[PDB]
Amino acid sequence: EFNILLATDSYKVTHYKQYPPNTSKVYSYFECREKKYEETVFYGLQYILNKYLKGKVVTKEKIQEAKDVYKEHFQDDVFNEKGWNYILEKYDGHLPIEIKAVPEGFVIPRGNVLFTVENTDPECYWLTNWIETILVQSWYPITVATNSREQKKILAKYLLETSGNLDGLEYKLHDFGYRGVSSQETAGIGASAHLVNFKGTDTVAGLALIKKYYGTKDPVPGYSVPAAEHSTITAWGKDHEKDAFEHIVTQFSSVPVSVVSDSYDIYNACEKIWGEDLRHLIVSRSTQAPLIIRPDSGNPLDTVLKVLEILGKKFPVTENSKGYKLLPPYLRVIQGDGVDINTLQEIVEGMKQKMWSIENIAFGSGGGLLQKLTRDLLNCSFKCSYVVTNGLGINVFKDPVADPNKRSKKGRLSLHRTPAGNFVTLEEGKGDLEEYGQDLLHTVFKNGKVTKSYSFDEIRKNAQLNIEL
Amino acid sequence: EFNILLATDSYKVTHYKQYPPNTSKVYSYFECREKKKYEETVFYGLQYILNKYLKGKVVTKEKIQEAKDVYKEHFQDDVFNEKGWNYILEKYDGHLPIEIKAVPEGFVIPRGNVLFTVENTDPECYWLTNWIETILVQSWYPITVATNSREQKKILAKYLLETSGNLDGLEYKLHDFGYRGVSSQETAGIGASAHLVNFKGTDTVAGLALIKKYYGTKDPVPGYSVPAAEHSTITAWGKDHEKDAFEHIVTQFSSVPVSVVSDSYDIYNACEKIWGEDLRHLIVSRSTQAPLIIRPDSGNPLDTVLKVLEILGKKFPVTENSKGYKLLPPYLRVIQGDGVDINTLQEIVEGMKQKMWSIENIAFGSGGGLLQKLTRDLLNCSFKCSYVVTNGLGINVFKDPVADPNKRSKKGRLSLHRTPAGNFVTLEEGKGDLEEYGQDLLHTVFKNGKVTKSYSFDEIRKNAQLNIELE
Ligand SMILES: Nc1cccc(C(=O)N2CCC(CCCCNC(=O)/C=C/c3cccnc3)CC2)c1
Numbered sequence: 051e052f053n054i055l056l057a058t059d060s061y062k063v064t065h066y067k068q069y070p071p072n073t074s075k076v077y078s079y080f081e082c083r084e085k086k087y088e089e090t091v092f093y094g095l096q097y098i099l100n101k102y103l104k105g106k107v108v109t110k111e112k113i114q115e116a117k118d119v120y121k122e123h124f125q126d127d128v129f130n131e132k133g134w135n136y137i138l139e140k141y142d143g144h145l146p147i148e149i150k151a152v153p154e155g156f157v158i159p160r161g162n163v164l165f166t167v168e169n170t171d172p173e174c175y176w177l178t179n180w181i182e183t184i185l186v187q188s189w190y191p192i193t194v195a196t197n198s199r200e201q202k203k204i205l206a207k208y209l210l211e212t213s214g215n216l217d218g219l220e221y222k223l224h225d226f227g228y229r230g231v232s233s234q235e236t237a238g239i240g241a242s243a244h245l246v247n248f249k250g251t252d253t254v255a256g257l258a259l260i261k262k263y264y265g266t267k268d269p270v271p272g273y274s275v276p277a278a279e280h281s282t283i284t285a286w287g288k289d290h291e292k293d294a295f296e297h298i299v300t301q302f303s304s305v306p307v308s309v310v311s312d313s314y315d316i317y318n319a320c321e322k323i324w325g326e327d328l329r330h331l332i333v334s335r336s337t338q339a340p341l342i343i344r345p346d347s348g349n350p351l352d353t354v355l356k357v358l359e360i361l362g363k364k365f366p367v368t369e370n371s372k373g374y375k376l377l378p379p380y381l382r383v384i385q386g387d388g389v390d391i392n393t394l395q396e397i398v399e400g401m402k403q404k405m406w407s408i409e410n411i412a413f414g415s416g417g418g419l420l421q422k423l424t425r426d427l428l429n430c431s432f433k434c435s436y437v438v439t440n441g442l443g444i445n446v447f448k449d450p451v452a453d454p455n456k457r458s459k460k461g462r463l464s465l466h467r468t469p470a471g472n473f474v475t476l477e478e479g480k481g482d483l484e485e486y487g488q489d490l491l492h493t494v495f496k497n498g499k500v501t502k503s504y505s506f507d508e509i510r511k512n513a514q515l516n517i518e519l
Numbered sequence: 520e521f522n523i524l525l526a527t528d529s530y531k532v533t534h535y536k537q538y539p540p541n542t543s544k545v546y547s548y549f550e551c552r553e554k555k556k557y558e559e560t561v562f563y564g565l566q567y568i569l570n571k572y573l574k575g576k577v578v579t580k581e582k583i584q585e586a587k588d589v590y591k592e593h594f595q596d597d598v599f600n601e602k603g604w605n606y607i608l609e610k611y612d613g614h615l616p617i618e619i620k621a622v623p624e625g626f627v628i629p630r631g632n633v634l635f636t637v638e639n640t641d642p643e644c645y646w647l648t649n650w651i652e653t654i655l656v657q658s659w660y661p662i663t664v665a666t667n668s669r670e671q672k673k674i675l676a677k678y679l680l681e682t683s684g685n686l687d688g689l690e691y692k693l694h695d696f697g698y699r700g701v702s703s704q705e706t707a708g709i710g711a712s713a714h715l716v717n718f719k720g721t722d723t724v725a726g727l728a729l730i731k732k733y734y735g736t737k738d739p740v741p742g743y744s745v746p747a748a749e750h751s752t753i754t755a756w757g758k759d760h761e762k763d764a765f766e767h768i769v770t771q772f773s774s775v776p777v778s779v780v781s782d783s784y785d786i787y788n789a790c791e792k793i794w795g796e797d798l799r800h801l802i803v804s805r806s807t808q809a810p811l812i813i814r815p816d817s818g819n820p821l822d823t824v825l826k827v828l829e830i831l832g833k834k835f836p837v838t839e840n841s842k843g844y845k846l847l848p849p850y851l852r853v854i855q856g857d858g859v860d861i862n863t864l865q866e867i868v869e870g871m872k873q874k875m876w877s878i879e880n881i882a883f884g885s886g887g888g889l890l891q892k893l894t895r896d897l898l899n900c901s902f903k904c905s906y907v908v909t910n911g912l913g914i915n916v917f918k919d920p921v922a923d924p925n926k927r928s929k930k931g932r933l934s935l936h937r938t939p940a941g942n943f944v945t946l947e948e949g950k951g952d953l954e955e956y957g958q959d960l961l962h963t964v965f966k967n968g969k970v971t972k973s974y975s976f977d978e979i980r981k982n983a984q985l986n987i988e989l990e
């Protein structure tokens with residue numbers, strides 16, 4: 051079972067002995083520090099509040115387990131047993147913490163307060179930063195959701211330019227990342243974050259997480275279709291690739307079906323197998339049930355362009371109302387190898403230059419989508435900005451000489467709309483002056499309870515692109 | 520609760536309809552594919568997966584029904600192999616009819632070798648082998664963390680031995696700072712445990728419980744830490760009182776090593792004029808067991824380390840060790856734990872060496888670089904079907920994409936062997952059966968729902984030792 055007393059960085063065990071004597075308040079905040087990626091989608095806090103922070107999180111057994119572990123880990127008795135016991139006894143093991151946060155799905159420029167944390171009992175001054183470690187992990191769903199939304203912006207731009215509309219947008223970036231993340235837990239968190247922006251996923255773990263922690267009106271938040279893998283083609287033998295293809299598209303004759311076509315020779319597969327031997331099985335398919343040809347190797351742009359050129363010579367191409375070429379409706383491509391935000395841009399731009407509509411393609415992304423991301427992409431960071439010691443509040447901050455980008459904010463913070471409707475973070479308690487209206491942060495956790503929450507449907511609404519609105 | 524029926528890539532739900540008819544066996548393997556440097560990989564983490572997710576009764580009627588219900592909506596179609604999952608429930612009380620054979624954990628194996636194989640033990644469950652690809656391929660993560668951590672240990676060992684003449688302290692020279700910087704609690708425990716294969720210092724507490732539960736150590740714990748400050752504990756004093764914070768902290772922890780982040784405002788002033796003058800008397804009186812460890816945390820990591828050492832060498836008595844390298848007094852050391860990854864680590868120790876500073880002077884912390892800034896394509900960790908039985912005939916299967924020979928997979932039944940010169944070879948096409956190469960190094964570790972062979976964390980560490988530590 052999870053034990054919050056064992057879910058912090060080791061050094062934080064020792065911090066209660068380091069703050070100024072008679073400190074009754076430690077007040078901290080989270081931002082995606084300013085330094086590409088100008089605005090971040092705030093998502094994932096609610097998962098952490100519910101799974102890890104709410105309710106009775108301290109027990110006698112957890113305190114004893116922690117004590118025993120830390121005694122050996124530090125080769126010394128430095129653990130605040132009394133401090134944890136106080137929480138157990140006074141609050142029935144509910145954390146005396148208040149968290150205020152911007153609504154989930156909100157899209158906020160860099161360098162703004164996203165949430166704040168403070169203790170609600172003077173005895174628990176040390177608890178605010180105990181829980182930095184677990185809260186800072188919100189970087190991950192924030193960053194996944196942000197980077198996925200940034201890819202959506204690219205796809206929207208190019209789809210609108212090449213087709214005149216956004217039809218199909220929220221299926222154009224499919225999550226392939228389940229195997230390529232670091233754990234089952236990560237898989238669910240990251241896949242949920244991608245689903246803020248798109249509807250297509252193979253990372254099944256995302257569905258249960260959303261259902262449990264956020265909720266949707268629809269039975270599920272994301273969808274998939276049948277598709278082949280190398281094992282299901284290659285198992286037939288090298289000389290029987292055509293047989294595998296015929297079997298699979300016949301098994302799935304009335305739903306869209308993706309078929310990995312590069313086991314031996316993508317270009318032969320497209321030109322000869324699909325384009326000649328099995329063409330009669332493709333041209334007969336419903337518009338609601340296309341064959342989706344999947345290359346999976348080689349230079350992504352060059353491979354997509356060559357696959358399209360092949361198919362456009364074997365199948366009847368049309369020219370849409372914008373002047374771009376369009377495969378027949380029973381035939382599409384999915385490129386799901388080497389896709390990240392940079393190659394995504396390269397591919398759609400190269401397709402546009404060769405007069406191929408983005409309607410012809412969808413993308414899959416695995417590691418690029420869910421794994422090839424770090425906390426330093428958006429500089430997601432938690433810092434103390436205010437303390438009260440001997441009854442006096444002081445504004446506190448770091449400001450390292452050699453790196454002004456690491457300067458932190460001072461004092462009590464609030465988030466506001468400017469007169470032009472942008473965001474601003476007021477420091478030093480200046481929000482109290484009421485020159486910029488009401489604080490946009492809401493209390494979402496207090497004293498062991500989640501006090502405000504968002505459905506997944508609301509999060510999605512909040513995270514929509516302008517071009518969509 | 521975890522449901523293995525919902526723990527696969529969605530498309531794999533449809534694959535039972537795609538394999539050739541009359542297929543009784545699907546046999547697949549995992550490797551860290553070679554790429555025409557990370558030449559060798561530490562095999563670690565499978566045992567976690569086997570125990571946590573794969574062993575015992577993993578199928579129930581309720582799990583079947585919930586998968587069925589989710590998949591109907593997710594696919595907008597009924598494609599789920601309810602019959603096949605029910606078969607396992609009724610026939611094997613929900614235990615997976617799968618055999619997995621693996622190289623022992625901690626083993627260090629060159630790229631492009633079989634590390635483990637998976638096959639179904641019941642013909643009806645031909646589809647189950649690749650169902651569990653997704654969950655098993657996540658072993659990429661502990662392998663990669665353990666590998667990348669070991670490659671960093673190789674760099675540290677080289678420069679420590681050069682600058683000092685020995686490896687003392689090596690075991691503590693790369694500390695895990697990564698708990699906040701990973702994507703989840705579960706990742707934290709897995710990655711931290713992988714780093715501890717190579718080192719003994721960690722602040723990622725999650726790693727300890729994982730090792731205790733799934734591997735085990737003769738010692739009470741596998742990893743250790745010391746007291747240390749963060750910006751909050753310094754800055755909470757007010758800037759004008761940074762010296763008061765330092766004094767308070769080193770006096771609180773006067774008898775153990777203590778790390779004190781020193782860059783809140785001006786790292787150079789803190790070193791030269793706070794530690795180097797105002798509080799010097801509290802540092803020179805410390806035990807060799809209980810040094811002050813000054814922690815910069817900003818600026819160019821090499822430049823900052825070199826400037827910090829230059830300042831400290833002017834304020835504190837420096838000696839020259841027997842190799843000619845400068846050494847701080849024993850009550851004073853440095854920890855650099857900003858911007859550290861395998862590339863910057865190398866830069867910093869080389870820069871130190873060029874300026875005649877012993878690596879004895881320094882330890883490193885690494886967070887995102889150690890545990891998060893890694894992907895499955897670093898070592899090309901990959902799982903592929905290499906053998907099937909169809910109509911009772913075994914056939915060697917493989918991929919070989921025309922545009923990428925690096926993605927060619929191995930053929931047939933595989934086995935891993937020592938070569939006559941003591942290297943490793945993977946034999947393909949069942950050639951291991953010829954017995955020209957001594958015993959297969961793959962052992963059965965899972966069979967029909969049971970974990971059949973386990974390794975302690977101690978054994979894993981032994982297996983993963985560096986040669987230089989052997990020598
Ligand atoms: N306009 C346009 C253009 C392209 C297509 C379409 C269209 O019909 N759809 C949009 C795409 C949507 C999903 C397709 C997933 C296919 N699945 C795979 O390829 C699975 C691979 C995989 C690989 C590795 C790991 N896990 C899974 C089906 C509907 C429309």
Ligand SMILES: Nc1cccc(C(=O)N2CCC(CCCCNC(=O)/C=C/c3cccnc3)CC2)c1
Nearest residue numbers: 059061688691696722747776778852879880881882
């Ligand atoms: N030769 C030599 C050279 C350098 C030192 C030493 C020496 O005494 N040791 C080696 C190092 C070992 C551990 C020190 C960790 C200190 N912890 C921190 O700085 C924690 C920071 C942090 C930051 C972010 C997230 N989590 C934690 C103490 C023993 C010997």
